[PDB]
Amino acid sequence: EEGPMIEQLSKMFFTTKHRWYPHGRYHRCRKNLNPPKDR
């Protein structure tokens, strides 16, 4: 279940709820799948 799960995650990892909420389609499209890796 969503909110509870989020809370659990937060507890585990020490962080706010806002990052665990899933971001939209446009943003994901934008993300670079093959970034330039070094070293």
Added chain:
Amino acid sequence: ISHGRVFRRMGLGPESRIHLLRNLLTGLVRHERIEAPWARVDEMRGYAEKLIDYGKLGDTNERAMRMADFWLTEKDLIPKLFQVLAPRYKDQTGGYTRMLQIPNRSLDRAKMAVIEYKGNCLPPLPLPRRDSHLTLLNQLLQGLRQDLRQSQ
């Protein structure tokens, strides 16, 4: 606010609503079946049952006669109400009027409904059955019942 408030608000006022109801009733009396919008249909049924009860009291009671006159506009129907419907339901108490849905009216997509006085002369409606007794769960239940009986 409209708590504990029977009677839907049908026509252009209460008189209008009553008139509408009456027409439906008349139709029912004529026909013994009507396709009609579901919200009014229940009202009709309610009225219909009462009307039948009234009819049961008999021709000779004047009040009943008056009521019949008021509610059956076509006037040939009053005799039918007295000399048929009442005869049919002398054994019953208030089981009359069978009211079931119809898919939906085509133009305005209203909720529809049928309204027959019980028994009647027309071809039977394709009624919703309960599941047959020979099915698995039902069988199990039966078995349980039997066991219980045995115990007691």
Added chain:
Amino acid sequence: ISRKWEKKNKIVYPPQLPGEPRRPAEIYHCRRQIKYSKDKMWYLAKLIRGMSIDQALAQLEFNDKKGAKIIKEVLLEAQDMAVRDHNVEFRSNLYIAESTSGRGQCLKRIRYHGRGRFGIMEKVYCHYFVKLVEGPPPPPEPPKTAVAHAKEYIQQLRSRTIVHTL
């Protein structure tokens, strides 16, 4: 006026080798200049999208909307096409891959407003598009679990570098 959807049924993919996956039958069909607004069509389309033909048909039957009938008709026609012309054996094995609504050519009329004034009514039309594929309807997104999220977070953590210095 362009019509590529119609064309799409006229492709011939070169024949398969014995040791190769089956390559399911894709089937494309439309209705043009339907009297409806595209956005209204879109909801119906959305409702259909991932579903087996049969399920979709069922849904359409009981959705009280003008366009629903049309969509159902289209689906039926598509099914028929699949069985006859496109060599799909089982009707039941067709699922809806795609369903979308385009805008048809629209007619302008006068609306006649109060005072001396007037709007321009545009009498709208739609093109309904369908793609059926052969095979059972693909499984939807399984909602990612807490564990998955945790894993992702861990990955992210790992992924970092010292940014600027070297």
Added chain:
Amino acid sequence: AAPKNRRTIEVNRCRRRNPQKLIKVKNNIDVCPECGHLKQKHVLCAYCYEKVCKETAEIRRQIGKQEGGPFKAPTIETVVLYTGRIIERDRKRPSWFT
């Protein structure tokens, strides 16, 4: 009142592509155990209801024919006989009128 700025397409999508406005995927639908043409729970089968309606209509017509003009409504419970008060149809009886 007048819109002070044009509503952006993204915003609009969010507004109008949200799950309250999307059409619900119902689960009332069962097969019609006689006739198989598929129907809602809590509702009479549309196809199954149709035949009955048709039958009623024909019977109604026959009744009308019997009873010359309007304002009759006799004092007898009517019966519908097909081929062996009475109303006389034709054909065999269907597998549902009994």
Added chain:
Amino acid sequence: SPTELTEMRNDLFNKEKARQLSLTPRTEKIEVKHVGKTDPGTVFVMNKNISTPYSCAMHLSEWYCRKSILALVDGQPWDMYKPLTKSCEIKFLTFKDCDPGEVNKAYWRSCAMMMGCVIERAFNLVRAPEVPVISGAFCYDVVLMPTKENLRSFTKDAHALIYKDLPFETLEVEAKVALEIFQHSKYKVDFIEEKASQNPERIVKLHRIGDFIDVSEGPLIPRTSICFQYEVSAVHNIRRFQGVSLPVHLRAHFTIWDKLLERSRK
């Protein structure tokens, strides 16, 4: 040994299947009619040793596939997944018919098989008894004491199996082959022999759930997923394990389910 045996039996089954396939010469076609209360009077032009009544169902619709369980071909119940030999007349059977007794028996058999499967892994099986529906359980006889925890575990296993969702593979086989398959288990062998004796053709009915294989008289339900509520009530002393289980299409609901379980327990 249990690690070997299962594999070996499976292999044997596969071989048998292959052999069966061998006999037909490259797609032989038969015209199978649909007798039924609805969707008449259709005929399906099927390929004989391959195509099942499931194919027929598919051709008709998806609804049929969902709800059909046994296929009465010439007034005798085939499994949905057991092929249609020669030109014949089909009826499809649900749980909710006027005459659902055949279906019920099949369901019971399936349940028994599932139970047996659960037993075999969890830790020799004599037979599945031919129990009615009013008797209020499906049993399975096993030669080896279990607690409530054990029962729970068993139930869980069954649930897992159901989730896995395996098709009930079918074959009607020679008796010799059957014997070969189950020569280690004596009771099973005896049962097979009895079955052979019963019929004129030897025609032993082998049924299979992925890895597990078993003998049974009647037909079986298509898949394990049709079981929805499945539990393992108690064991009574050979040791007869009992169970009660209701499918999708007839869900019990809590209190009722509990009552049923209690009944089974007796």
Added chain:
Amino acid sequence: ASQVSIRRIKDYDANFKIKDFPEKAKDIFIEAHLCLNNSDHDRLHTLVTEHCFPDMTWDIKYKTVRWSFVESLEPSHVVQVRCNVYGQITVRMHTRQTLAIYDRFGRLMYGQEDVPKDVLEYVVFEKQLPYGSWRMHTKIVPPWAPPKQPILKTVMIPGPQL
């Protein structure tokens, strides 16, 4: 009657010999079938008449056939011949023919590609009598050959809807 027809044909043409014709006919047939594989409507129409062309090209559209030819059994025979002015010949044919019909997507719906099957044909040819030539008109479905190859996919035949 046949003889008379032949004579008439000779008179029309004029130079014509039926001792070599069957072979020619066979060759033409082969060419036509080759064309069918490669979808050459340009080449086909020099062979095969306006009656037969649409009969052997409509069904086979959007779908790739993989025909081949191999060892004709018996000699190429010629049965009955008869005769605006559009003549008619009939040819009996007994050959080994491969057939593999693949759909829009690939797949395979009729027959095996490698395995050759032995076939009977009663092929009727016609010709126009200025720049005409001998082209296929009909395939006579007699005598009573042992059905066809069975279709791979299963089929449902809907009954009378109500």
